[PDB]
Amino acid sequence: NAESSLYESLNSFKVANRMLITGTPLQNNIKELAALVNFLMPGRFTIDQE
DNA sequence: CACGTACGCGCTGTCCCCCGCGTTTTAACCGCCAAGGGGATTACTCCCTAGTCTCCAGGCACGTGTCAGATATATACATCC
Numbered sequence: 001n002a003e004s005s006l007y008e009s010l011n012s013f014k015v016a017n018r019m020l021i022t023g024t025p026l027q028n029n030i031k032e033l034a035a036l037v038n039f040l041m042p043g044r045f046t047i048d049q050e
Numbered sequence: 051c052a053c054g055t056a057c058g059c060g061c062t063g064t065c066c067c068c069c070g071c072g073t074t075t076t077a078a079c080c081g082c083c084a085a086g087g088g089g090a091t092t093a094c095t096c097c098c099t100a101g102t103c104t105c106c107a108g109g110c111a112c113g114t115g116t117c118a119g120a121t122a123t124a125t126a127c128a129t130c131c
Contacts, residue, residue, distance in 0.1 A: 005081065028084085 002035035011039060 026033045034047035
């Protein structure tokens with residue numbers, strides 16, 4: 001979730017390189033995967049159509 | 051104003067129950083889904099109903115005459131000394 005407090009807490013960190021380790025990248029819809037790829041690298045990847 | 055006595059108040063005992071502290075538990079709090087309904091707005095359409103107007107008539111208020119029940123005498127029969 002991009003709205004949660006953990007998302008804004010970790011997204012405000014001054015880290016050069018990030019990595020996400022999970023088993024299920026997409027669970028409900030493509031908006032969640034959009035949130036993960038926005039947390040990874042913010043802006044060259046956009047998802048706006050469901 | 052006088053009297054007198056009952057009760058407010060001060061003192062003492064006593065016991066009991068609440069407070070302080072330490073220890074253990076536990077649920078409030080914060081952060082999370084998971085979808086779905088409730089409700090606040092914005093815009094639009096429609097139609098029923100309440101305001102407005104005119105006219106009229108009877109309900110309410112006032113006044114007054116009467117009328118039936120309650121109260122107070124007028125006279126006659128029964129009764130005590």
